[PDB]
Amino acid sequence: SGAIYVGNYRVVNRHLATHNDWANLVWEDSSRDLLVSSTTAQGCDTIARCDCQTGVYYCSSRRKHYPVSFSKPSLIFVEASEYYPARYQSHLMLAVGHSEPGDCGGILRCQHGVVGIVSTGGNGLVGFADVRDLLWLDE
Numbered sequence: 001s002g003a004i005y006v007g008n009y010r011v012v013n014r015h016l017a018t019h020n021d022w023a024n025l026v027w028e029d030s031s032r033d034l035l036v037s038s039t040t041a042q043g044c045d046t047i048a049r050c051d052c053q054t055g056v057y058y059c060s061s062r063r064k065h066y067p068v069s070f071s072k073p074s075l076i077f078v079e080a081s082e083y084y085p086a087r088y089q090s091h092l093m094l095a096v097g098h099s100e101p102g103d104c105g106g107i108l109r110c111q112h113g114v115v116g117i118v119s120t121g122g123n124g125l126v127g128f129a130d131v132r133d134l135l136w137l138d139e
């Protein structure tokens, strides 16, 4: 679990969104596993606007943060689950690192701020849904 709180927005994995998230929907994209809902309180997370390929992520299954090199956002094949059939997920970045399903939502951060959130993993790899292209999160 985990979310990004920026301005009047809450960014979460689409497969983990709640009833309240869907009742206050701003935007959702199944192909990216993202959903943004509105909030009454003000969020203070800074979103990075960069092309960094290094950062730190929070891994809840280990109660630890890990430094990683990650690939540029791209389409990556993702196995079927109870949330989606087998498909390509777009805007996904991979890193070598530990992850388990409950790790989804952990933030990936570089020196410029929030990069994305854990969205996939398996076999010593972890995938992050990128958020740096969502310029509207700021205005």
Ligand SMILES: COc1ccc(F)cc1CC(=O)N1CCC[C@H](C(N)=O)C1
Binding pocket: 015, 033, 078, 081, 083, 084, 089, 099, 100, 101, 102, 103, 104, 118, 119, 120, 121, 122, 123
């Ligand atoms: C962090 O997730 C891990 C990690 C290790 C694992 F063996 C398995 C997973 C789960 C995973 O990748 N899923 C299930 C939930 C939806 C995801 C998606 N974005 O389509 C795909």
Ligand SMILES: [Zn+2]
Binding pocket: 048, 049, 050, 051, 052, 110, 111, 112, 113
């Ligand atoms: Zn950066």
